[model samples]
Target: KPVSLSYRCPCRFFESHVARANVKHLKILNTPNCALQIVARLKNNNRQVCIDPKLKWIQEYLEKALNK
Candidate 1:
């Protein structure tokens, strides 16, 4: 037998949950640098960790998401 997997629309849920959760916003000083640091730390801390090979877009996305 095999296990089953399911997925839901995180965007739909997150929009409401995040609003209700009252999560505090983050302010990233340097996006590219911070993203690199996070990716590096995850890679170093976890051997099985994997980050997208292309980080430029992720960096920008994270910066905007966290900052605003």
Candidate 2:
């Protein structure tokens, strides 16, 4: 089966967490892994990727949404 797509930018993906999101304080900082030495984008104008912490969480909810 083909996977459904929302085609939305990471800026607007905050709603996937089941709670409202405010893009008020998005800023660039080190990744939360602490083990890895890298950075990720945290902004409304920026696109999130697989390396995004929140993206992983959102995928779980999407899978549940798709199966249901």
Candidate 3:
């Protein structure tokens, strides 16, 4: 049987607090919604087979995102 899972927030203790402070600096409105959408995309796309076939592409994308 397939396992059911729950949505988890990625922010750490310090980051969680820091994110709240940084929210005010955002030019875009609806910060929380935007954050949730990004997390949701990451979680959904980070599965085993979802990542294996295009691992290099995924890694390159992540590197670009992290570096930039």
Candidate 4:
């Protein structure tokens, strides 16, 4: 299917749940250009992984992270 390879945008996202201990840092990507809404920097291999914003734990974590 060559039609699927039309655009030149990066598609990276984590489809599973992430543990809090694995996250070294959290970066909120609110930019409209990107596909994912949140980027988490992991501690294991220092990898940046895309995270789902609608997750309850993520929402609560964002609230706590941004509030204070």
Task: Name the candidate that leads on TM-score.
Answer: 4
lDDT of 2 by residue, 1-68 (tens): 99897544333222333211423232323434332221233355454322333555345544666788
For model 4, the superposed segments whose C-alpha errors exceed 4 Å read 1-11
Residue 14's lDDT in candidate 1: 11
Candidate 4 structure quality by residue, lDDT tens digits, 1-68: 55665434343655368777889988776656656567787899688777887777897887888897
RMSD of each: 13.7, 15.1, 15.1, 3.2
- lDDT (10s digit) by residue, model 3, range 1-68: 99876444342211111122123221111234223212111223332111121234434545776799
**Greater-lDDT candidate between 2 and 4:** 4
Model 2: weakest 10-residue lDDT segment is: 11-20
Per-residue error (Å), model 1, residue 19: 28
RMSD of 4: 3.2
Predicted candidate 2: what Cα RMSD to the true structure? Answer: 15.1
Relative to the true structure, candidate 4 reaches a TM of: 0.66
Once model 1 is optimally superposed onto the true structure by TM-score, how far is the C-alpha of residue 6 displaced, in angstroms? 21
Candidate 1 residue lDDT tens string, 1-59 = 89775443212111111121222332223243233222221222232222342355445
| Regions of model 2 farther than 4 Å from truth | 1-54
**Poorest 10 consecutive residues by lDDT, candidate 4:** 6-15
Clash counts for the predictions, in order:
0, 0, 0, 0
Instruction: Evaluate residue 41 in candidate 2 and report its C-alpha lDDT on the 0 to 100 scale.
Output: 39
TM-score of 3: 0.24
Q: Compute the lDDT for candidate 2.
A: 0.37
